Design an enzyme around this catalytic site. Sequence first.
Site, short mmCIF file in Angstrom:
data_model
loop_
_atom_site.label_atom_id
_atom_site.label_comp_id
_atom_site.label_asym_id
_atom_site.label_seq_id
_atom_site.Cartn_x
_atom_site.Cartn_y
_atom_site.Cartn_z
N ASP A 35 0.82 -1.20 0.00
CA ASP A 35 0.00 0.00 0.00
C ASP A 35 0.86 1.26 0.00
O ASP A 35 1.34 1.68 1.06
CB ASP A 35 -0.92 -0.02 1.23
CG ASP A 35 -1.84 1.18 1.30
OD1 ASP A 35 -1.93 1.90 0.28
OD2 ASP A 35 -2.48 1.38 2.37
N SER A 199 -0.54 15.59 -12.08
CA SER A 199 -0.77 15.22 -13.46
C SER A 199 -1.01 16.47 -14.28
O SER A 199 -1.58 17.44 -13.79
CB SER A 199 -1.97 14.29 -13.55
OG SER A 199 -2.32 14.03 -14.90
#
EC number: 3.4.23.22
Length: 330
Positions: A35, A199
Amino acid sequence: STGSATTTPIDSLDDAYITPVQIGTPAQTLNLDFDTGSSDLWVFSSETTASEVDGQTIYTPSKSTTAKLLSGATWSISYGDGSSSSGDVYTDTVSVGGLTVTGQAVESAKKVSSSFTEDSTIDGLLGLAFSTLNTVSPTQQKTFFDNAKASLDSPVFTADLGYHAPGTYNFGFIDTTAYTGSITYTAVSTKQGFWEWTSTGYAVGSGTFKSTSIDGIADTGTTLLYLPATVVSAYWAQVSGAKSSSSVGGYVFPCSATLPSFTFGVGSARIVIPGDYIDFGPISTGSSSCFGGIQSSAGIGINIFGDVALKAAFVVFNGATTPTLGFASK
């Protein structure tokens, strides 16, 4: 040193991935959910409330000659999905794919929430976010990666998750045969303890690319792709019959639909998520309403590049003094 381990979907939907991890002496092998959005290595154990264990493999520290109670240490974590766990702490030897750390904090669960009990395939979590998020008190503990880092050939790990197929976590090296083209690296902020990056935009299907900054986290422990409501609406608008269902808890679409791809930007580079990756199947057995793999992050408080996005790429988690993230197509 290096390590290399195969990671395997827990079910036919890629709801999560499990990776075998050797704990203790002799080794006790547990299948953990790696994770990158948390920083605790915790396991089902001989200490877990019996009614809360249902098919998982447990760690029994009393059977490990290298286990030592970390005296006074406790831990307690709650995840973004509402699940939780807590317990005490041992140090022990932990190996992943041939890479061994001695003195690793192994957080033994005394209690786990229903979600964990009900998932027989996941024996615990191995956190790979920054150690500043680790919940051990009163002495915060380091992640497996943090402990291994100085011994690694290069201070990196990579995630290469499969679509409906196994993939690979590597530690200490970049497998140049595992991706196509070049790796595009992008800046990371560690201010919130995550692999947080920005992004450069998105496209829906064969549509034009929208240049827009989207801050989010690279999170192998989250199944889906969670993005701003504007972006998500634009995606689902291209699927006839798709709608946001408050009763179901997100966007659903007719199972008869063909889904468009979704492209996200990494610098000037582009990662394409094929439409099929965005199909999470019937909302309930036999239903013709299917659950979408791109969902709104509104009310999460952060955008999350979960497995839906990450599995479309070869991803480098660069833990150099100034960390960065790399993405390549594959």
